[PDB]
Design a protein around this ligand. Structure first.
Ligand code: NA
Ligand code: NA
Lengths: 475, 470
């Protein structure tokens, strides 16, 4: 065959009868040893790297070239494994998440259908049923894994739209009244992208006023709904966010949901980040009201430390996916009751994320996550206290998760020079402190953003951060 | 109190190096054992979930991995010849190990400084291979469904200016055209885009499952007469069931003649660009407005790996990207999340780039040749047996065929072919798929496994001969 020819490297594939096993094992071990050396020594690389030409070669690259490429890829990539990386909802991966993706890629199954993923499709369906149980959604609840929270939000909104307008087969172009959804002004932009994609347009996402603590104002929500109907629009969904992207705040889920139900609006909870609190006895009360959601988005890739991507959309009634999403096609359900997951997802073919998810959940355990979450809050509160002791600094508001947004508002500077002050501080922290904070645009200004995810971030890192902030301000 | 395993994470200062090395090695040795011994497992497997409070033991995790592999489908078996799902290239497996380890995010340049630039440059080069021109480029997507979704979204946005106001105010229903043999992801995309599944108007296909240009013309005029608004034609380069290629040049010319967006779904057949001998089959694709292509299929890249390419990559900024302050880097690159359906995204470019380098264009040309050779062996085997019938001519390494025995009434043909398919798998350890096609059940051979040989094909027909009595 081709694998005996001189046009293929002897290690292009793994011979299923072991004829090239020694050569493969050697190549595999090269990469394993290299990557392990890079990860066990990750602190040697800064949180951010210090800075083609791309041509697809005719002949096979040498193993020396392949390994150099891997080396260059790692060295030029961001390093959230560095204890000083505290700026984004992007964590160092759990060991079993890395190993899970090795397993997933090796067996290379397809979530598209049962016969292409006999074990994984069943594992995923059962696992998400259990997880929906943790959210308190009831016994009809379930969902699918998606390649990212944006897709999860897209699918929920698609179901909300289909349920309200019966649009699976005729579409929505016939409507005289514009469909609109409501969300906090601090909600994620994937909502606007979803609305665009769904044929609603970006402007169909009506922003609801958030408080000083970046939580949705239920009073304004009700006002916006009335105003929308007054404008001849057709509201059909409300989105509450459980852990906003910038400040990590949690909307008042019960109040929002009650308003949604009063007006017959689909209640979607975007808990991409904050959804992890269900593993925390100490903190899951913060999610009170989420158990009544019509749909939930949750991203284990964030606070559950699962290697990207890992996200899901859960429905309180999983059958809604067959009634108001699934395209017309003959039934092909298996004898033990499972359905081809491709039929009820945005994606068709899909990578088996369930492997790394299930393996990581088992390795760490609920108690493990409860501990990690507590440490997150602990570090966040240390940042909060440090800011409060510095009058030239300002919190964005109360915190609800392990995220602290703050900025310098010094009186030796006029307000219009604050963005440059903070941008320079962020640059200084990274360059000389090897500490990475993000600098999002928030409330028309530039704010510093701390996301305390790295389990190897210590009190000393935070202290070092403030120590350098002090010098930049001349204390 | 609550316990974290010493190997839950990898200590960046090496304090748990020895323990994490041992755990990784155990999984590596287990996976390598299963793959180098994959022929020991049949193509398909033979025959409660609670999140634990406490950390699971290493023995438990390894046993779970063992159970997961043994319970999975096995395309690495030489007898797996039924789907567009191949055994992964070695560097694709290793690529995903690398990607998970560094755990970067394709959402923005800041979160994937190397990967974002590598992907953009790689897809420019690939767009060039399709002959799309100097402005061409695109993004990797998690699946060809998303690629088709994004392409059709852009087509819609360009024609109806719908990025901000949407399409609800329209009076004429927007419709697209595709072969009756085209992929169902078009219908799902149409549903998602607010067009509805019925917006995909099926165009008659020939006996060889290729879109008929004249019927395309007829359906378009008909749509306009029925007060509809055509805005896109989708040609398919490698249909899912039979693997046939639409006449891209003729379809594209008709599309451009009617001012319609021309999208080529080359999810499978796109791989032919790496074949000097066979890429002439995609003649006409170079004038497409957009192209879908899935390296996860015929380029052996572990799932997922797919892309959408645009002849003018700039159209993503004018008719897709949502309003936001621009954040362009000084070297010209843009945050990929802004111009994709997905935001956060797994770095598929790692396995794609490593696999492309390892196999090379020569390697893919060789693999593709072998596929055609095996396919032609199946076609010849069918032609020698009057009780079997070909679905039509083949264009790629895919052969769709079925038994139509005269000792059975036509209503029993489905059962005959279903029984044959089950017999082949159980007795011969040979997997063919059995899709619904033209109202019946057809056998489907997809000859992708580099370790599938003539003997496998011979054993298949011998098995077929026994079942038929011959
Ligand atoms: Na709009
Ligand atoms: Na993926």
């Amino acid at each position: 065959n081709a694998m005996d020819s001189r046009f293929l490297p002897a290690t292009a594939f793994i011979d299923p009868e072991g004829r090239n096993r020694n050569e493969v094992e050697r190549l595999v071990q090269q990469v394993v040893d290299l990557i392990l050396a890079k990860l066990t020594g990750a602190a040697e690389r800064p949180p951010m790297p210090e800075t083609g030409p791309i041509t697809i070669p005719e002949a096979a690259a040498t193993e020396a070239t392949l390994l150099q490429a891997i080396r260059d890829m790692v060295d030029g990539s961001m390093n959230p494994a560095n204890p000083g990386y505290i700026g984004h909802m992007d964590p160092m991966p759990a060991t079993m998440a890395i190993l899970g993706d090795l397993v997933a890629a090796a067996v290379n199954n397809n979530m598209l259908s049962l016969e292409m993923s006999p074990s994984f499709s069943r594992l995923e369906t059962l696992l998400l049923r259990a997880i929906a149980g943790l959210f308190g959604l009831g016994e009809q609840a379930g969902g699918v894994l998606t390649s990212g929270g944006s897709l999860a939000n897209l699918q929920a909104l698609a179901v909300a739209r289909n349920v309200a307008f019966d649009s699976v087969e005729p579409g929505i172009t016939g409507l005289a009244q514009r469909p609109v959804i409501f969300a906090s002004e601090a909600a994620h932009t994937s909502l606007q992208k979803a609305a665009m994609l769904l044929g609603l347009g970006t402007a169909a996402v009506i922003p609801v006023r958030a408080t000083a603590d970046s939580r949705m104002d239920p009073e304004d929500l009700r006002a916006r709904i009335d105003q929308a109907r007054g404008a001849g629009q057709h509201p059909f969904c409300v989105v509450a966010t459980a852990g906003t992207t910038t400040t990590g705040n949690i909307d008042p889920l019960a109040e929002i949901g009650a308003i949604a139900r009063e007006h017959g609006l689909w209640f979607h909870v975007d808990a991409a980040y904050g959804g992890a609190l269900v593993f925390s006895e100490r903190h899951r009360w913060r999610l009170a009201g989420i158990e009544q959601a019509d749909s939930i988005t949750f991203n284990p890739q964030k606070w559950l430390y699962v290697a990207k991507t890992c996200a899901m959309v859960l429905f309180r009634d999983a059958g809604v996916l067959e009634r108001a999403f699934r395209i017309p096609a003959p039934q092909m359900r298996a004898t033990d009751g499972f359905i081809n997951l491709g039929e009820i997802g945005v994606q068709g073919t899909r990578h088996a994320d369930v492997v790394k998810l299930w393996l990581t959940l088992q390795h760490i355990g609920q108690q493990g996550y409860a501990r990690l979450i507590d440490d997150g809050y602990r570090l966040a509160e240390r940042v909060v206290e440090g800011v409060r002791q510095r009058p030239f600094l300002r919190l964005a508001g109360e915190i609800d998760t392990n995220i602290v947004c703050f900025r310098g508002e010094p009186d030796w500077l006029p307000a219009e020079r604050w963005d440059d002050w903070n941008a320079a501080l962020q640059a200084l922290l990274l360059r000389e402190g090897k500490i990475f904070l993000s600098l999002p645009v928030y409330r028309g200004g530039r704010w510093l953003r701390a996301v305390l995810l790295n389990p190897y971030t210590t009190d000393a890192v935070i202290d070092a951060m403030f120590k350098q902030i002090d010098r930049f301000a001349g204390r």
